[PDB]
DNA sequence: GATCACGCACG
DNA sequence: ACGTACGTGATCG
């Protein structure tokens, strides 16, 4: 059964022939600044196993592998790029890339190895990178000989693998998604990580002593409240000091006690002066334990940067998520969290954070796709859409909507975004299923294109068995078709949002190799540093933020043509906190 | 130790 | 609600 290869101990002319499958091998999850543990080529003339001590040593392996016209096939090359980078080596020429092929025709495989993509295609004479390497404490690099057969079997299969996986996505027109606009982002992503974000320690370490003084504090007032010491964060020991020693009403359970979530605190704040101290004490042990821990715990101690790894492979509808540390999450929306941002600060002197954001692109999406005449209109007029949504579903003038009824149309347009149900827009809004009905009615006798949307593309999803987003990328929703009413009403959810998120998601992506393009042409240091879904964040020169203002929005606005305008914000300033 | 349950940060 | 990451404490095994 053993698959035959020569285990290299210099680098030949042969192996560097102008197609081949490429194996860098990084076993470390986080791939910065990682080992390389061996090297696998497979190409017209044979299969290789190389040490990586001496390919990336070999003049002609390095030049072979930053020579664009020299074409590699490979699984998840951002991996490899980015430990190269470290190691001041260009890759260049990758052309197919085998884990976002897999990803694109079904984002649901969770494929995340070589195995797992080749399964797909009754390939299966490669092992599990977790079969291999192990999990967990156990896991562990092997000897030679087991891992040059199994850099070697990865990049046999990615050999063989690369024709029928395009060929799949021609026929689901998506080819151009892959090689136009995910393989670009690709290399975008890798820059974005590599460069990494600087953190202001100090500053976050002054945060970590004030949160710390404050904790102390209430803390010790919810004991006093409790007469009695306990584990504020165990929500059996808390549940017990809430819904029995000091008998609040037990408005919700969990599948093992007490509901202690937020809503249900909130709701009980008015009983007792415990609750909103609970609640204070969260919203505190949030930062320090999540945010000033947590940063401080992977930012590197040599240059004070953070580098996050985008999973460009993961979302089930095409957006990125972020890894150690999550830098699509810092707080926000409450102002004590928010300063969280001022430790967050540019990597040279003289530089300033330029943050711009789309403004409701969901819904300007939904627009598009609904051709509703009524939301296109208020979109060309750039009205506040939450407003003019209040006008229409409560029948009033601009002058008459009040700022509860903003609020109320504000979660019906959230609910029409995520896939609307009566039970999911009156937990939101704490009002009964019925009254939440008579709103969704109200907002589809105003938006009556997008009710035909909602209905039209959920019948598209049984008929075809999955939807699509603008630049055609897919998910299947075989649940669509089940006889049980939660489980088919989800899925009809995700018919409803995935179109209006993954488009967005498509929209971003086409902006951000767009603005890269731009940035080349124009020859400004700026550069991109994070996404965070439908923002993009850039420091650069102080000297550069005029022309940065009139560039970054109008690519942003221009990277797709919709039958509403694109509209984009922007700020920028001395830390992320300011750019603002 | 590993995994689950719960809670909560973001768009 | 739709889509994510992850920290703490409880429980599985
Ligand atoms: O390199 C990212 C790429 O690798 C995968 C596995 O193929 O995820 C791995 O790397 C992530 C980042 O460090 C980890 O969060 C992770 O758990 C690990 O499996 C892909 O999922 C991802 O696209
Ligand atoms: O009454 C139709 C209305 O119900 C929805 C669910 O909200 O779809 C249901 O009705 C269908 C056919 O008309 C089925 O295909 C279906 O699976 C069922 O859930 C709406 O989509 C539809 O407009
Ligand atoms: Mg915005």
Known sequence: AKMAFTLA???????????????????????????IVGIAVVNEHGRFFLRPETALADPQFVAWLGDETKKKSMFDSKRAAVALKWKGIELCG?????????????????????????KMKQYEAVRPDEAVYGKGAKRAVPDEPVLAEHLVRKAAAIWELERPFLDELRRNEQDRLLVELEQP???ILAEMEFAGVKVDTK???????????????????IYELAGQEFNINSPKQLGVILFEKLQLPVLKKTKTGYSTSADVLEKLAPYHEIVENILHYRQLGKLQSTYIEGLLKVVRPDTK??????????????????TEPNLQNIPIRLEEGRKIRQAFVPSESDWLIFAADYSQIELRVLAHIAEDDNLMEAFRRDLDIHTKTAMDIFQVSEDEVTPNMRRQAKAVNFGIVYGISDYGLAQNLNISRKEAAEFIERYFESFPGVKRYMENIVQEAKQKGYVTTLLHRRRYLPD???????????????????????????????AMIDLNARLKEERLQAHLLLQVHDELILEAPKEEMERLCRLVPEVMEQAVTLRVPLKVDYHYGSTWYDAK
Do not use: W
């Open 9 to 35: 101990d210099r680098v030949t002319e042969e192996m560097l022939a102008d197609k081949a499958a490429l194996v860098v091998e990084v076993v470390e999850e986080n791939y910065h600044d990682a080992p």
């Open 94 to 118: 990758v052309s197919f890339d085998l884990l976002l092929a897999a990803y694109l025709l079904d984002p649901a495989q969770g494929v995340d190895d070589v195995a797992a993509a080749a």
């Open 305 to 322: 940067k953070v580098h996050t790894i985008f999973n460009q492979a993961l979302t089930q509808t095409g957006r990125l998520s972020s």
């Open 480 to 510: 669509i078709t089940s006889r049980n009413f939660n489980v088919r009403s989800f899925a009809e959810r995700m018919a409803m949002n995935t179109p209006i998120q993954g488009s967005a998601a498509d929209i971003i992506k086409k």
């Open 185 to 187: 982002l690709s290399s």
């Open 203 to 221: 500053r976050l370490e002054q945060m970590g002593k004030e949160l710390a003084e404050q904790l102390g504090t209430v803390e010790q007032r």
